[PDB]
Design a protein around this ligand. Sequence first.
Ligand SMILES: [Mg+2]
Ligand SMILES: [Mg+2]
Ligand SMILES: [Zn+2]
Ligand SMILES: [Zn+2]
Lengths: 437, 437
Amino acid sequence: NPFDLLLLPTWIVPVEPAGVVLRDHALGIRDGQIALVAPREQAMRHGATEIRELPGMLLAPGLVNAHGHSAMSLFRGLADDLPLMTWLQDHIWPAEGQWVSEDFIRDGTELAIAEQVKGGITCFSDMYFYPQAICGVVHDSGVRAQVAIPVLDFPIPGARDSAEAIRQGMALFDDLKHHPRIRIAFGPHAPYTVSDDKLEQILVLTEELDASIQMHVHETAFEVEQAMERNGERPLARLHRLGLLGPRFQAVHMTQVDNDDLAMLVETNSSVIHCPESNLKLASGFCPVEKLWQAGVNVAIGTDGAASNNDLDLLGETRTAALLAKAVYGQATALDAHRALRMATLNGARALGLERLIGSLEAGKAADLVAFDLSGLAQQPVYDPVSQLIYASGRDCVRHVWVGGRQLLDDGRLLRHDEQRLIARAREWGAKIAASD
Amino acid sequence: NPFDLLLLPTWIVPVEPAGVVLRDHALGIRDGQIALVAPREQAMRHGATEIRELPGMLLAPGLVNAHGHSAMSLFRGLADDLPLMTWLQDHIWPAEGQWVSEDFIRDGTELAIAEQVKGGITCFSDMYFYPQAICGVVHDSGVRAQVAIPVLDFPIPGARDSAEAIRQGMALFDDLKHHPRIRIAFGPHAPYTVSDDKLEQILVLTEELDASIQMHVHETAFEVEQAMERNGERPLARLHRLGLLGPRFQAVHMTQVDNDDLAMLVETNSSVIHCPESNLKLASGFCPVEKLWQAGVNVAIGTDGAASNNDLDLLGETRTAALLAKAVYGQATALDAHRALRMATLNGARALGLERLIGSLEAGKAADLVAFDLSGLAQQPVYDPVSQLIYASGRDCVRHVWVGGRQLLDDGRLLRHDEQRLIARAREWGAKIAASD
Ligand SMILES: [Mg+2]
Ligand SMILES: [Mg+2]
Ligand SMILES: [Zn+2]
Ligand SMILES: [Zn+2]
């Protein structure tokens, strides 16, 4: 009974146990799962149909991009450096009104997946329009995904109202019930865009389905202050009041965190999705990551959409996060390199409810893997491969990617996408969108 | 009268004038200098000995890395995530004492220059030991540099006291008087480490030689407080009192700025060198870049050493600066992409006193040029190439680099360095340094 594939990289970082880096080790894959992580000597005895040596490379769990709006890849750099509401009202919202259709979503989503896989990301979360179309693209691509159904108080592309959005959502939930790679979640945009009734409605359906909820929460001081002078109650407190908080709740951003907020996070075991670069670019503020971490809150990381980043580089986000957390907390020891990688992998898994399947290199879990090349000039000398990954390596060093043991990236080449076709298609869109803007 | 070389990129960003992007244009070089920036049809009638078509590429002034400690490349990732004093006392200082020799400086500096050229950097400033060694390496590499003589109250490698370091500096200044690419400066480390006397000596010398001074200034709240309590005056204030502040003074870091600090920067026309990533990583603080900018202070940008970054990626550093400035200032309009590119180029030139030579694509200036490929998937679609450069491109997109019209990088290949042996050398040093650590 040989492995299907045995990988022999210079270094393996399993993430669990924390801090550990393995040398002269092997990872064996069988039937899509990690069957063994062990010394090379030991593993070579089981036999393997295929054996790949990966000298100079670091093998890790695939990255988990825990929050995105993928098809906004087509809006990448459309209008930068404007006031937030000018950006939205003069540029993003009209462009969405004119251009967002199933064709837009299909092209923009595939564009985004292609970029993410190239950057070593094996699992992502999407919160955008035409979810059914999104799922189709995710299915073909082979990556893992949470697709969150957008629910709002007003018409959006694809849904004339919240009722239709939930109906389409429910139909989606059923159709993908046994999909091995995709899970449906609910994704109400933010507390300030969704009614209490809609929130309670979402909760019932969610507990009915054991499904997750992802929402932008406390992204700005303005949202929080305004909820005060209006309702006399912090948005998170309101969500807590209505019973939406919990281990399946994903609070995105959370730049505004007081002690009541914190206690509510620790109590409900809710996840926070950290999006540092978007927070900086939009002047939203500084998520207190080390503080949340020390309290025991699960903190994952996402890129947000490519129009406020403007790349979908999770390795890059993670470095930004690891650097920023030190200055925000006031200590150089905050969010260290191993914890940063954990945030980008196992914590993402936990946020998305997938921590039994992915996020660490342990026997029994899915073979969602990324191999990073550390043999480049600018990475020398390599004293600690994980330090060098986090603080000195770019996403271009990603060489190979597997999801469920199926290879999606081979020496930097995408096996499930035609890169030049997507480029050409993205250009056709950009030409049209540029003209309308 | 044909050009030696004519370049035909999709885009040209001359930096001067600001905000302008030229399409269907050409840059013509003759005798190491920019001779013509005009429409292609006008420029082609001049004829050219060599013509390069660069479709999909953005042609810009070469990036100027205005602060670093280049040979610390050999300590890259040696000991991360430690308290600052533990990092210095238990890792960096021991290793400097034991290993920093002229050979170490040569290897470490060349390694750093190779990484920098690959990332589009045409000019850099160094503040590290064995300045004579550094200059030799800089000469061979063909890049432009300011080499600042380290001056300190303590024995440092190569110089047992400030008087010897100044004697070596003076000799170096005379040797290299006619070098077209290297400028010598004085680099007292920081005010807390250089006597009131040594500083006045340096001042009389630079005024006599019209040389620049670079120093780490107000890097930490700690430094400032300690001075305030111990002397009754802020380090900047003391510098201004001694008459050191001026157009040739480069104040590095400046995370601590009060209203008096600002006025003194404004009145003296001193440059600030912003190093956001080092400031984040060491939890030094947040330089108020937009505040300085709006007050008319010239702000350049540097990477610092590779042991507190941990790369020498100025494009990446600039992205970090541009993102960070918006949340630090509280507005998404702060440090826009064109101004950020200006900081990485012309402001760098001004900082180093080289603004008449480099920093912008204007006739009469040196042909110091970088070509960035924007034809990649993750960069599509391109609306503003400058926005896409700053917010969505990695340094791996750097394809071609010229210094004084001499090509140093051709389609990503170094013409003046052998990467493979530089890597082997780096690994030799890594083995030794790892053992002693
Ligand atoms: Mg990014
Ligand atoms: Mg860097
Ligand atoms: Zn979002
Ligand atoms: Zn420095």
